[PDB]
Design a protein around this ligand. Structure first.
Ligand SMILES: CC(=O)N[C@H]1[C@H]([C@H](O)[C@H](O)CO)OC(C(=O)O)=C[C@@H]1O
Length: 474
């Protein structure tokens, strides 16, 4: 008989707009990862001030060693301190938002890659004008600092020493090696031995320096099964092109290729916007990857690059076409070596791109599956084997709006084609972002967004189900 466990709340939001027991109003953006040790890591955005995509947001996780039955206390990966002088608290804090979790099967290192924005309104507060964020000097990439009244770009060098645009050291220094809990001291700006402010503050500043106002990508990793995490690493320069406006991850759980010429490659879903149409018509999915176990990262090409739309070719850097957009996505590798990218879009149904070269380039045929509705919200999908047959499990809202969570089952053939077999409900009422993981022995787990009884968006809950729940009619 079909089996589905009762929902268990992992990250509890407050209700009626009030903070929860820990003084936090909202939780969002679930990530679920089953590690080599069998541990379950549930990650999420800890949105203290409100549910919006900005403000004071920490990257946190909880661990379960009994396959989801019980969970340990919250573990904070990164939580930047707010600007104590910001006029509007709701938007007065440097921001981290949306994470992707994944573990290297060989080194066992667990990665959490997430967005970073200096103080502001995140993706909804990006400037119309670009500001250079890095500058190369003698084969050395340094992060730039701007000072009001001066056009020249200062730079942060060894030991966090701030250098003038002319190449001279100053008495200013940045905390590049934070040591406080959650690394809340990262970016602190000192003059001599006195703390003046923070390079991530953009308003009512007390120090002379700030980084470029742009979208960044950070990475933290754990070598102890998620118990402790390293200080944030800025990987933005390795993958963000000069034309890119926004560059962020497609939240959830990434993968490591299991077969093919690119086996071992780590894939992280991401998406960008350009300066032509930004959020109106340029959101384009793609992936970033690492072939050296997370040491260095590289950007693949966008699904939209050289894509044919209405008889004409477009590019992710210049496009202005609402319906041709593809944003957050989930990635899966098939046994035939192909990489499938299920992308959140505006067609009303499931859009999927296919890569034959480890995720670098994408084939011309972007298939749509009317069998799986898409109300324009994040989704997750995972590869799975059952009785010698290859399948794909995908979960997302069934509609009309972000509600009625569904778990779709598809059969994968040798040519990589998909055949949707079943569509079973898993959660009534509100349902949004989710993250699926195979637990083994025919069981699966899912961390998802849901609310009820007046809960703030959202409360992240966990459920487990087996094959009987997937196939047989409920
Ligand atoms: C970085 C960021 O803002 N991510 C947010 C995402 C984004 O705003 C959208 O993809 C832009 O089109 O939207 C949503 C959402 O619930 O729909 C929550 C995500 O945290």
């Amino acid at each position: 008989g079909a089996a589905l466990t009762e929902k268990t709340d992992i990250f509890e939001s407050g209700r009626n707009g009030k903070p929860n027991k820990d003084g936090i109003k909202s939780y969002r953006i679930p990530a679920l990862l089953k590690t080599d040790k069998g541990t379950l890591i549930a990650g999420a955005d800890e949105r203290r001030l409100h549910s919006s995509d900005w403000g004071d947001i920490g990257m946190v996780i909880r661990r379960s060693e009994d396959n989801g039955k019980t969970w340990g206390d919250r573990v904070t990966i990164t939580n930047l301190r707010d600007n104590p002088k910001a006029s509007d608290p709701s938007i007065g804090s440097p921001v981290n938002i949306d994470m992707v979790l994944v573990q290297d099967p060989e080194t066992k290192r667990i990665f959490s890659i997430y967005d970073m924005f200096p103080e502001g309104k995140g993706i909804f507060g990006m400037s119309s004008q670009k500001e250079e964020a890095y500058k190369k000097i003698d084969g050395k990439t340094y992060q730039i600092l701007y000072r009001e009244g001066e056009k020249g770009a200062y730079t942060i060098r060894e030991n966090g020493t701030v250098y003038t645009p002319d190449g001279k050291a100053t008495d200013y220094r940045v905390v590049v090696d934070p040591v406080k809990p959650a690394y809340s001291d990262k970016g602190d700006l000192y003059k001599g031995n006195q703390l003046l402010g923070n390079i991530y503050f953009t308003t009512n500043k007390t120090s002379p320096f700030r980084i470029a106002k742009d979208s960044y990508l950070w990475m933290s990793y754990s070598d102890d099964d998620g118990k402790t995490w390293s200080a944030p690493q800025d990987i933005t320069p390795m993958v963000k092109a000069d034309w890119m406006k926004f560059l962020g991850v497609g939240p959830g759980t990434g993968i490591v290729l299991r077969n093919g010429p690119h086996k071992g490659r780590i894939l992280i879903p991401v998406y960008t916007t350009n300066n032509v149409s930004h959020l109106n018509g340029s959101q384009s999915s793609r992936i970033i990857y690492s072939d050296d176990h997370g040491k260095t990262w590289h950007a693949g090409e966008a699904v939209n690059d050289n894509r044919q739309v209405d008889g004409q070719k477009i590019h992710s850097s210049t496009m202005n076409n609402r319906r041709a957009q593809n944003t957050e996505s989930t990635v899966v590798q098939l046994n035939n070596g192909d990489v499938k990218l299920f992308m959140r879009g505006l067609t009303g149904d499931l859009q999927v791109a296919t890569s034959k070269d480890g995720g670098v380039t994408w084939e011309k045929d972007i298939k749509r599956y009317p069998q799986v509705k898409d109300v324009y919200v994040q989704m997750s999908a995972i590869h799975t084997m059952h009785e010698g047959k290859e399948y794909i499990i995908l979960s997302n809202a069934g509609g009309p709006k972000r509600e009625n969570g569904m778990v779709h089952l598809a059969r994968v053939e040798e040519n990589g084609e998909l055949t949707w077999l079943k569509h079973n409900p898993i959660q009534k009422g509100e349902f949004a972002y989710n993250s699926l993981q195979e637990l083994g022995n025919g069981e699966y787990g899912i961390l998802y967004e849901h609310t009820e009884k007046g809960q703030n968006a959202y409360t992240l809950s966990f459920r487990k189900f087996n094959w009987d729940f997937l196939s047989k009619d409920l």
